[PDB]
Amino acid sequence: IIETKMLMGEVMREAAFSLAEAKFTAGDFSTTVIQNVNKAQVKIRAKKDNVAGVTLPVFEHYHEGTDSYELTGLARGGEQLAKLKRNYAKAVELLVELA
Amino acid sequence: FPELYFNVDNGYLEGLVRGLKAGVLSQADYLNLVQCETLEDLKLHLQSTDYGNFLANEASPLTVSVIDDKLKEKMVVEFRHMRNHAYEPLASFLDFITYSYMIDNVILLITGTLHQRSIAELVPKCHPLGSFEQMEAVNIAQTPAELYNAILVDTPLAAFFQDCISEQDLDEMNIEIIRNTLYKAYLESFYKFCTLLGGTTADAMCPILEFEADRRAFIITINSFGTELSKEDRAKLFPHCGRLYPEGLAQLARADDYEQVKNVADYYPEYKLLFEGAGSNPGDKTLEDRFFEHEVKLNKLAFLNQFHFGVFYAFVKLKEQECRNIVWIAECIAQRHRAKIDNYIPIF
Amino acid sequence: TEFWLISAPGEKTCQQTWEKLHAATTKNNNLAVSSKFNIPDLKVGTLDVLVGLSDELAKLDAFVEGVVKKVAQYMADVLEDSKDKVQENLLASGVDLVTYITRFQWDMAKYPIKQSLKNISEIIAKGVTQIDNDLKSRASAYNNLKGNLQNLERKNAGSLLTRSLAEIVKKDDFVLDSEYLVTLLVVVPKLNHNDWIKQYETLAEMVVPRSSNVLSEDQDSYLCNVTLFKKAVDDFRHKARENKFIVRDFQYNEEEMRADKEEMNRLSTDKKKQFGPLVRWLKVNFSEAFIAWIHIKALRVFVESVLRYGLPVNFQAMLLQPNKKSVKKLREVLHELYKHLDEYYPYVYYKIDCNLLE
Amino acid sequence: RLGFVAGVINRERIPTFERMLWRVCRGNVFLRQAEIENPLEDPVTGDYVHKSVFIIFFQGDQLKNRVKKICEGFRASLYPC
Amino acid sequence: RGKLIAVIGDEDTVTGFLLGGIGELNKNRHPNFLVVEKDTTINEIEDTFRQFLNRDDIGIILINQYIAEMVRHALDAHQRSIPAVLEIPSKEHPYDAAKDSILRRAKGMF
């Protein structure tokens, strides 16, 4: 947990500064992203281990394929936004392991 | 020809906005800004340039979000104090600048109604350079179809909707296809308008708008490949103004991978240089960054002719770039990620 | 340079259709240099395997082409000089691409003909997938050493603004190891240096006269040490920057000059010790990947022939080297010879591209 | 194992239908077809359609999936026999 | 069936994970996130945190580290094993474990 929180610090600092690097080209996409929600591309499945007779709950990271934000920044910033959606998907995959 | 009469109506504002161009951060100001280590030092540097006192009487725990809002407040007040003094030819032209921001507001309004959100929730989020003159749509806020009718009544954008969009299309289109079809009509109409203001406006302004059309065709193309957009959807979204219109747009509608987009860019030495100037590797300037540098090269060069409207568009796009730059430098300083701080775009 | 592969039934045996084919493709005009092609009698089986392979081999073709192109590009990326010698080093069966295409050999020991088409295809998939795993490994070895040597070279290139302190720093120019004393270091343009020689004494209090000491000068600029009392330094450095005098502090850093020297020697030496093994591994991997790539062509030809003509086989696998001046007439002769069998064609058709060497 | 399907399709689709079957089941499909003794009435529109029966023969489930995909592509209907 | 992650944070932290694919409406049109504007009262944040931890669809809550210090009472009162809570760092905010609830549960922590 302590190691994974330090690694979370690294990936989150990278993704947060990458959001600023996207905002530099894309402008306020944040309002559009916040308003235009429907269904999650990433979801979590509860799974179990039974070591020493004790059931331990964990999560598996799972992915729905469909990108609800696919056309965002098509005209401008879509290069940095494509890096950004990957960086926050990598942040989520680490956070589901941390959870 | 135009020199004789242009200063009759616009010569004050031509002088005012050139005054406001002297009010920009030089390359030396950015090279001073990046030295320092906290948002309080950004305040002390901006206190010394033409931005003096802009951040007095504000919360002592500064944030980069305050810097963004205050730079927008400066930019909008400078623009309103010109638009309020401009006569009909320029005033229509300045309204074509505001129409770009109005498109990015009206799309939020429609998006909000499609998700049952009240327009009063989005009013504070709308760009102040795209602010509405008539509020009946804002006051009603009931349904997407009601808003469509209220936009046609209230909003200068009404003609762009009538050229491209029914209310039934707004129930079925992706909001980013909507924004782009509006921007197509906006550019084609504004380019026509600039050619009706023929001579030194068109001769300095059309090089910018033709680049906006060419840049959109490139960037929309290279971004579409990872998406559900068809060849026909790319063709429908491209602006018809730029040098690519005779065939470049057709070849980009045929394209499906980045190599074919470069093969279009290879025909025009400017676009050949923009692509060959960016591999988009780690620590490299990206392809879109090279376009943002060239958009600035054009908008600087539009100041080289004393008797035209090109300065007002160029001023706005350069103050927008200056707001992009100051925020990016403020982020690098506040977040301590100084490694990319040189990625602002120099202006003059 | 490009080659075409075809397959079609014999009248009763494979020879009989080839005799008419290769004659028409060479004697009507030089439409293509024309020959048989070396596909052996692999062990046939059920349509369940043949049709599965008819899609899997197409996915494997695109993958294996990508891998052999990456091997060739890695050999081009070590050949950063002598770039044209790529065609002397990309070899399969010990010969040039055009030659092993023209003189193809199926490897009956690595790919035993008595094995099923599924087993042979899986051997290629596994083998070339490990070549791709090796390319990920060898990229992580080479590209980091390449980038580090490029950064060491960037630390030697250009003016005093970018060239290495280790080439110019010497102990006698410094005042250090002291409570009240400091040495600062500043870069100035060669024109502006004529002001700097006096002007540094005006930037702050507590500066002794005649304490600017040049380490070296170049085509653009000077770098000097400034020796002064400790109270001066923060005002001095800040006011140097405000007047465009570029601070570049390096207080005889013995560990850092030693690191620049030792790493310049090491990264050049290690890049050479990577280059030799890389060219050898890339030669073996290119040979195996290109051999296996043409084995996917042979499998696609064989599987489609055993489909298109069934199991009572008498087809001839064939090779063509098309001429660009007459490639449309080549297609017309291939159609004229085979229109009765049924881009798409009534004969089996595939190609090989030699531009791996650019 | 051996396998086969039988079904019904509009008669004008037959030339493209047999060509597509020979493309997906590469060069190898045994088949036959015939026009029905009268056109058949549409359950929704009441239009009378000049349908034709067909039968298709192969081996294994991999070919069953290809012939069925092409039947659905031409809006043909298969039946158990 | 799979669970969904939920987020309490500023506009950038929410926007970041929304582009990370996290965003879903429940069928009742309620979101799985809260944008904390500076004007938002701590009681509204706490009510959201309480709604998220008591909801059956949500499996993880991400709380920006500065919010976790404001809502700290309810956050330390929450002790269920399944609905996990991550206090997370961000661009203008404290370090990755500032008074972390799990590291305070731990016996071997320094």
PDB file of N, CA and C in Angstrom, chain E residues 55-107:
ATOM      1  N   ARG E  55     -24.777   3.618  -1.463  1.00  0.00           N
ATOM      2  CA  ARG E  55     -25.218   3.091  -2.764  1.00  0.00           C
ATOM      3  C   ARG E  55     -24.670   1.687  -3.038  1.00  0.00           C
ATOM      4  N   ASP E  56     -25.447   0.869  -3.745  1.00  0.00           N
ATOM      5  CA  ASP E  56     -25.086  -0.522  -4.069  1.00  0.00           C
ATOM      6  C   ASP E  56     -24.292  -0.684  -5.375  1.00  0.00           C
ATOM      7  N   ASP E  57     -24.381   0.272  -6.298  1.00  0.00           N
ATOM      8  CA  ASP E  57     -23.702   0.217  -7.597  1.00  0.00           C
ATOM      9  C   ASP E  57     -22.225   0.632  -7.504  1.00  0.00           C
ATOM     10  N   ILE E  58     -21.927   1.623  -6.668  1.00  0.00           N
ATOM     11  CA  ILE E  58     -20.573   2.130  -6.450  1.00  0.00           C
ATOM     12  C   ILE E  58     -19.726   1.111  -5.681  1.00  0.00           C
ATOM     13  N   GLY E  59     -18.522   0.820  -6.172  1.00  0.00           N
ATOM     14  CA  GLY E  59     -17.568  -0.086  -5.525  1.00  0.00           C
ATOM     15  C   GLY E  59     -16.313   0.589  -4.964  1.00  0.00           C
ATOM     16  N   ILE E  60     -15.900   1.744  -5.490  1.00  0.00           N
ATOM     17  CA  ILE E  60     -14.761   2.540  -4.986  1.00  0.00           C
ATOM     18  C   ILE E  60     -15.158   4.016  -4.991  1.00  0.00           C
ATOM     19  N   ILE E  61     -14.722   4.804  -4.020  1.00  0.00           N
ATOM     20  CA  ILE E  61     -14.836   6.256  -4.045  1.00  0.00           C
ATOM     21  C   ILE E  61     -13.434   6.851  -4.056  1.00  0.00           C
ATOM     22  N   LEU E  62     -13.115   7.677  -5.041  1.00  0.00           N
ATOM     23  CA  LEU E  62     -11.899   8.482  -5.065  1.00  0.00           C
ATOM     24  C   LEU E  62     -12.210   9.843  -4.449  1.00  0.00           C
ATOM     25  N   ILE E  63     -11.488  10.247  -3.416  1.00  0.00           N
ATOM     26  CA  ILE E  63     -11.662  11.542  -2.777  1.00  0.00           C
ATOM     27  C   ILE E  63     -10.368  12.306  -2.948  1.00  0.00           C
ATOM     28  N   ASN E  64     -10.398  13.479  -3.570  1.00  0.00           N
ATOM     29  CA  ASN E  64      -9.203  14.317  -3.628  1.00  0.00           C
ATOM     30  C   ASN E  64      -8.706  14.654  -2.208  1.00  0.00           C
ATOM     31  N   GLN E  65      -7.403  14.586  -1.956  1.00  0.00           N
ATOM     32  CA  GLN E  65      -6.826  14.558  -0.610  1.00  0.00           C
ATOM     33  C   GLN E  65      -7.269  15.737   0.262  1.00  0.00           C
ATOM     34  N   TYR E  66      -7.386  16.928  -0.320  1.00  0.00           N
ATOM     35  CA  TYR E  66      -7.867  18.114   0.379  1.00  0.00           C
ATOM     36  C   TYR E  66      -9.327  17.975   0.844  1.00  0.00           C
ATOM     37  N   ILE E  67     -10.185  17.327   0.052  1.00  0.00           N
ATOM     38  CA  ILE E  67     -11.569  17.049   0.452  1.00  0.00           C
ATOM     39  C   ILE E  67     -11.600  16.047   1.592  1.00  0.00           C
ATOM     40  N   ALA E  68     -10.750  15.029   1.547  1.00  0.00           N
ATOM     41  CA  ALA E  68     -10.682  14.037   2.605  1.00  0.00           C
ATOM     42  C   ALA E  68     -10.362  14.659   3.976  1.00  0.00           C
ATOM     43  N   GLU E  69      -9.562  15.726   4.020  1.00  0.00           N
ATOM     44  CA  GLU E  69      -9.336  16.483   5.255  1.00  0.00           C
ATOM     45  C   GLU E  69     -10.560  17.298   5.705  1.00  0.00           C
ATOM     46  N   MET E  70     -11.404  17.770   4.785  1.00  0.00           N
ATOM     47  CA  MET E  70     -12.624  18.516   5.124  1.00  0.00           C
ATOM     48  C   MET E  70     -13.755  17.601   5.610  1.00  0.00           C
ATOM     49  N   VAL E  71     -14.001  16.498   4.907  1.00  0.00           N
ATOM     50  CA  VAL E  71     -15.047  15.507   5.217  1.00  0.00           C
ATOM     51  C   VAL E  71     -14.574  14.434   6.216  1.00  0.00           C
ATOM     52  N   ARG E  72     -13.419  14.662   6.854  1.00  0.00           N
ATOM     53  CA  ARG E  72     -12.651  13.686   7.642  1.00  0.00           C
ATOM     54  C   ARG E  72     -13.480  12.898   8.655  1.00  0.00           C
ATOM     55  N   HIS E  73     -14.454  13.533   9.303  1.00  0.00           N
ATOM     56  CA  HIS E  73     -15.356  12.881  10.258  1.00  0.00           C
ATOM     57  C   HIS E  73     -16.096  11.695   9.635  1.00  0.00           C
ATOM     58  N   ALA E  74     -16.856  11.920   8.561  1.00  0.00           N
ATOM     59  CA  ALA E  74     -17.579  10.837   7.901  1.00  0.00           C
ATOM     60  C   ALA E  74     -16.618   9.835   7.246  1.00  0.00           C
ATOM     61  N   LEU E  75     -15.507  10.317   6.682  1.00  0.00           N
ATOM     62  CA  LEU E  75     -14.510   9.459   6.044  1.00  0.00           C
ATOM     63  C   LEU E  75     -13.868   8.476   7.030  1.00  0.00           C
ATOM     64  N   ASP E  76     -13.561   8.912   8.250  1.00  0.00           N
ATOM     65  CA  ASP E  76     -13.064   8.027   9.301  1.00  0.00           C
ATOM     66  C   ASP E  76     -14.187   7.223   9.981  1.00  0.00           C
ATOM     67  N   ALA E  77     -15.437   7.689   9.943  1.00  0.00           N
ATOM     68  CA  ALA E  77     -16.584   6.912  10.412  1.00  0.00           C
ATOM     69  C   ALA E  77     -16.926   5.739   9.471  1.00  0.00           C
ATOM     70  N   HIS E  78     -16.627   5.861   8.176  1.00  0.00           N
ATOM     71  CA  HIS E  78     -16.800   4.795   7.189  1.00  0.00           C
ATOM     72  C   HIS E  78     -15.783   3.662   7.389  1.00  0.00           C
ATOM     73  N   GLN E  79     -16.255   2.430   7.607  1.00  0.00           N
ATOM     74  CA  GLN E  79     -15.398   1.284   7.962  1.00  0.00           C
ATOM     75  C   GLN E  79     -15.755  -0.038   7.249  1.00  0.00           C
ATOM     76  N   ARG E  80     -16.638  -0.021   6.241  1.00  0.00           N
ATOM     77  CA  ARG E  80     -16.988  -1.217   5.443  1.00  0.00           C
ATOM     78  C   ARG E  80     -15.812  -1.698   4.585  1.00  0.00           C
ATOM     79  N   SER E  81     -15.711  -3.006   4.360  1.00  0.00           N
ATOM     80  CA  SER E  81     -14.609  -3.603   3.592  1.00  0.00           C
ATOM     81  C   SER E  81     -14.736  -3.404   2.078  1.00  0.00           C
ATOM     82  N   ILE E  82     -15.937  -3.544   1.502  1.00  0.00           N
ATOM     83  CA  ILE E  82     -16.153  -3.523   0.042  1.00  0.00           C
ATOM     84  C   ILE E  82     -16.020  -2.114  -0.569  1.00  0.00           C
ATOM     85  N   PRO E  83     -16.818  -1.099  -0.179  1.00  0.00           N
ATOM     86  CA  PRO E  83     -16.796   0.239  -0.783  1.00  0.00           C
ATOM     87  C   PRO E  83     -15.528   1.025  -0.415  1.00  0.00           C
ATOM     88  N   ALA E  84     -14.416   0.709  -1.074  1.00  0.00           N
ATOM     89  CA  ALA E  84     -13.090   1.237  -0.769  1.00  0.00           C
ATOM     90  C   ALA E  84     -12.990   2.736  -1.056  1.00  0.00           C
ATOM     91  N   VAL E  85     -12.222   3.467  -0.252  1.00  0.00           N
ATOM     92  CA  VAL E  85     -12.029   4.913  -0.396  1.00  0.00           C
ATOM     93  C   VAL E  85     -10.563   5.219  -0.609  1.00  0.00           C
ATOM     94  N   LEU E  86     -10.216   5.941  -1.666  1.00  0.00           N
ATOM     95  CA  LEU E  86      -8.835   6.347  -1.906  1.00  0.00           C
ATOM     96  C   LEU E  86      -8.727   7.855  -1.742  1.00  0.00           C
ATOM     97  N   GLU E  87      -7.941   8.296  -0.772  1.00  0.00           N
ATOM     98  CA  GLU E  87      -7.521   9.687  -0.689  1.00  0.00           C
ATOM     99  C   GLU E  87      -6.384   9.899  -1.707  1.00  0.00           C
ATOM    100  N   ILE E  88      -6.564  10.778  -2.698  1.00  0.00           N
ATOM    101  CA  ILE E  88      -5.640  10.921  -3.842  1.00  0.00           C
ATOM    102  C   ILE E  88      -5.018  12.324  -3.970  1.00  0.00           C
ATOM    103  N   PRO E  89      -3.730  12.447  -4.323  1.00  0.00           N
ATOM    104  CA  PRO E  89      -3.065  13.734  -4.502  1.00  0.00           C
ATOM    105  C   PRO E  89      -3.465  14.391  -5.822  1.00  0.00           C
ATOM    106  N   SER E  90      -3.204  15.693  -5.950  1.00  0.00           N
ATOM    107  CA  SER E  90      -3.486  16.476  -7.161  1.00  0.00           C
ATOM    108  C   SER E  90      -2.677  17.786  -7.214  1.00  0.00           C
ATOM    109  N   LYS E  91      -2.701  18.476  -8.358  1.00  0.00           N
ATOM    110  CA  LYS E  91      -1.717  19.483  -8.801  1.00  0.00           C
ATOM    111  C   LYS E  91      -1.400  20.642  -7.833  1.00  0.00           C
ATOM    112  N   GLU E  92      -2.371  21.072  -7.031  1.00  0.00           N
ATOM    113  CA  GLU E  92      -2.255  22.165  -6.049  1.00  0.00           C
ATOM    114  C   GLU E  92      -2.530  21.675  -4.609  1.00  0.00           C
ATOM    115  N   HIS E  93      -2.349  20.376  -4.344  1.00  0.00           N
ATOM    116  CA  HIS E  93      -2.896  19.688  -3.168  1.00  0.00           C
ATOM    117  C   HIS E  93      -1.834  18.904  -2.381  1.00  0.00           C
ATOM    118  N   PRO E  94      -2.141  18.485  -1.140  1.00  0.00           N
ATOM    119  CA  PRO E  94      -1.212  17.753  -0.277  1.00  0.00           C
ATOM    120  C   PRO E  94      -0.743  16.391  -0.824  1.00  0.00           C
ATOM    121  N   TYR E  95       0.267  15.811  -0.167  1.00  0.00           N
ATOM    122  CA  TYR E  95       0.881  14.521  -0.513  1.00  0.00           C
ATOM    123  C   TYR E  95      -0.075  13.318  -0.428  1.00  0.00           C
ATOM    124  N   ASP E  96       0.297  12.234  -1.114  1.00  0.00           N
ATOM    125  CA  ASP E  96      -0.490  11.018  -1.386  1.00  0.00           C
ATOM    126  C   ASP E  96      -1.042  10.234  -0.169  1.00  0.00           C
ATOM    127  N   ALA E  97      -0.674  10.609   1.058  1.00  0.00           N
ATOM    128  CA  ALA E  97      -1.076   9.909   2.276  1.00  0.00           C
ATOM    129  C   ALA E  97      -1.269  10.814   3.512  1.00  0.00           C
ATOM    130  N   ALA E  98      -1.554  12.105   3.320  1.00  0.00           N
ATOM    131  CA  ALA E  98      -1.726  13.069   4.413  1.00  0.00           C
ATOM    132  C   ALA E  98      -2.843  12.645   5.397  1.00  0.00           C
ATOM    133  N   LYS E  99      -2.463  12.127   6.577  1.00  0.00           N
ATOM    134  CA  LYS E  99      -3.376  11.539   7.582  1.00  0.00           C
ATOM    135  C   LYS E  99      -4.304  10.451   7.011  1.00  0.00           C
ATOM    136  N   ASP E 100      -3.770   9.601   6.142  1.00  0.00           N
ATOM    137  CA  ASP E 100      -4.525   8.533   5.486  1.00  0.00           C
ATOM    138  C   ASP E 100      -5.228   7.580   6.472  1.00  0.00           C
ATOM    139  N   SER E 101      -6.518   7.306   6.263  1.00  0.00           N
ATOM    140  CA  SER E 101      -7.291   6.460   7.182  1.00  0.00           C
ATOM    141  C   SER E 101      -6.758   5.027   7.283  1.00  0.00           C
ATOM    142  N   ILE E 102      -6.321   4.418   6.183  1.00  0.00           N
ATOM    143  CA  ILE E 102      -5.800   3.049   6.186  1.00  0.00           C
ATOM    144  C   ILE E 102      -4.452   2.991   6.892  1.00  0.00           C
ATOM    145  N   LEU E 103      -3.548   3.920   6.598  1.00  0.00           N
ATOM    146  CA  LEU E 103      -2.260   3.960   7.290  1.00  0.00           C
ATOM    147  C   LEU E 103      -2.411   4.277   8.787  1.00  0.00           C
ATOM    148  N   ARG E 104      -3.478   4.972   9.204  1.00  0.00           N
ATOM    149  CA  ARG E 104      -3.812   5.145  10.628  1.00  0.00           C
ATOM    150  C   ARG E 104      -4.459   3.911  11.263  1.00  0.00           C
ATOM    151  N   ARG E 105      -5.200   3.091  10.506  1.00  0.00           N
ATOM    152  CA  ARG E 105      -5.628   1.754  10.968  1.00  0.00           C
ATOM    153  C   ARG E 105      -4.435   0.823  11.189  1.00  0.00           C
ATOM    154  N   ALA E 106      -3.417   0.909  10.336  1.00  0.00           N
ATOM    155  CA  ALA E 106      -2.277   0.000  10.352  1.00  0.00           C
ATOM    156  C   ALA E 106      -1.456   0.070  11.656  1.00  0.00           C
ATOM    157  N   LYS E 107      -1.018  -1.094  12.156  1.00  0.00           N
ATOM    158  CA  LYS E 107      -0.147  -1.205  13.344  1.00  0.00           C
ATOM    159  C   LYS E 107       1.336  -0.979  13.029  1.00  0.00           C
TER     160      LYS E 107
END
